[PDB]
Amino acid sequence: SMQAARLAKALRELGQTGWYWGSMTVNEAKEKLKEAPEGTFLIRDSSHSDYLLTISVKTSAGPTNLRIEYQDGKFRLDSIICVKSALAAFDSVVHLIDYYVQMCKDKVHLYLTKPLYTSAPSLQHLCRLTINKCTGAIWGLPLPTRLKDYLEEYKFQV
């Protein structure tokens, strides 16, 4: 699989999340997260030419933004020039977000909790999220293979 195909699969899952806000601006994200609980996040298109996506997250000090870099077919958080550039990188940007959400499941360092949905997602996708939080073994589930195929297209917990 060449990089272009890998990036396309990563972008298709982004549209299946329900917290991808497209061409949202920096101030538009400030208002949707101004009163949200700490850790509430969303992902949107970066208005910068050197970046594809940007994480807008509500912190205790207020809403902020952190861009996502795409280099050598891997997504990673924006950090210093090579001082801390060997860090967590994944082929899927949803994987990158799910990785950091589960990391802060315990209780600067990024703190993500619950995403800010654009609209109410489908009941099918809501069940998939609840199932993904319980087990990762789709074969051991009493479901028709049509639904097992559905569970594989989105294996994340966020």
Binding site: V26, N65, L77, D78, S79, K84, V108
Partner: peptide
């Protein structure tokens, strides 16, 4: 810019 963050030690 002003409302953006980078990761730093």
């Amino acid at each position: 810019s002003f409302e953006y963050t980078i990761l730093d030690p």
